[PDB]
Design a protein around this ligand. Structure first.
Ligand code: FMN
Ligand code: FMN
Lengths: 214, 217
């Protein structure tokens, strides 16, 4: 499977089968993903991969947070930018309706069970790391996501876990020197599920690339 | 070429031939790279791709700052974390070893080549709105790595370059970008000189032991 095809076929999967994931395969995938670049070769990404009973523990700890209402929230940072304008948000609303086309509470709690993935990756780093190092983490993460598709697996990046970073970090036994960026649900896609088959929009290049001197 | 092979063969190339880059191919690489994910599908990345005379103007303007010594610096942000400790600090000097081994004064001289994109014919400047936060910066990395892998797949090479953020204001000026924008990084783009010493040394990575923790398996 070519990089183009991997890129094309990678999507945020929100329904996984219970087909087990080969730990050997994941390990091999992480080996190659480490070839992602990073400023100064800092390789600042760190990951705690959980499954089974531990993975169920994280779910329950956060579940406890969730019933606490707005008091249970423990933001690691600002997920949505303060000062998001509505022309930016129309992008999320464009994908937001299509995902669906109150009830919302129900689907969003599925986030916190990783949409049924058997494995959950938690991507974190030292609190000393700055914005370019977070960009390095993105490079690694997208490397992982593409390798998963190539290898017959699927994934869903989830920043929703950062709503409860401290709880997650505590449950993972990570120090308060670490900060949680995102979760990544991992597993085999339910490839007959509707939520996994709608076409996902992107803006046109006219909104992205400016050419000069050509 | 498979995604695994792309990941494996992608390196930070610091010696390019002067074979031009096909504008058409670059355009085709960017529509596919746009399939990168992003929080909320915000797609926060923006890029200004320069070549020829424009790419020469950016070079000259930054060179003017460069001779100003350290009084000329215009950092967009903190490139290296201030107070960077081990294990991390040993990692950059170690790759620093291998990069120069395959080549004070001369050391300095080579580093300044950064500001000519190591001779690359094309330079992409990746930027975004200043409203964007750290998670949006990770979104940009996701996009950038998509581009770098697609290049490799199509026989092109690149060098991501944060060195340009040392003179962000000047670069933004020469590109005509507003101060609502912040420059993250450059990406030098071109055809790799596949006999260059600088391009053939094996690039180290830490073992998974330092990266991955497994729980419940
Ligand atoms: C850093 C990051 C965090 C994300 N967090 C979530 C999340 O918490 N819940 C969710 O449903 N999707 C999440 N996503 C998926 C995005 O909504 C998705 O990538 C975007 O809508 C584009 O859709 P696609 O990836 O299927 O192509 C996240 C994506 C990224 C890159
Ligand atoms: C965001 C970013 C900025 C970078 N900036 C520079 C740079 O300014 N100069 C340079 O020589 N290399 C730069 N690099 C390349 C890294 O040094 C390189 O990725 C690392 O040593 C690993 O080497 P490799 O990518 O060839 O495997 C940058 C990489 C990243 C991700």
């Amino acid at each position: 499977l070519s990089a183009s095809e991997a890129l094309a076929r990678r999507r945020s999967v929100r329904a996984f089968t219970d087909r087990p994931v080969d730990r050997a395969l994941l390990a091999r995938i992480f080996e190659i993903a480490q070839r992602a670049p990073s400023g100064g070769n800092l390789q600042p990404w760190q990951a705690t991969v959980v499954t089974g009973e531990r993975w169920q523990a994280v779910q329950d700890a956060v579940a406890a947070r969730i019933v606490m209402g707005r008091e249970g929230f423990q933001p690691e940072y600002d997920i949505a930018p303060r000062g998001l304008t509505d022309p930016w948000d129309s992008r999320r609303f464009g994908v937001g309706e299509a995902l669906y086309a109150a009830g919302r509470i129900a689907q969003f709690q599925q986030n916190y069970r990783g949409f049924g993935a058997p494995v959950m990756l938690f991507l974190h780093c030292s609190r000393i790391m700055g914005p370019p190092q977070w960009a390095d983490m993105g490079m690694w993460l997208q490397s992982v996501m593409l390798l998963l598709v190539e290898h017959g697996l699927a994934s869903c990046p989830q920043e929703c876990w950062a709503m409860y970073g401290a709880t997650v970090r505590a449950e993972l036994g990570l120090g308060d020197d670490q900060i949680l960026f995102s979760g990544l649900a991992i597993g085999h896609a339910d490839e007959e599920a509707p939520v996994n088959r709608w076409p996902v929009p992107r803006v046109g290049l006219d909104e992205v690339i400016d050419w000069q001197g050509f």
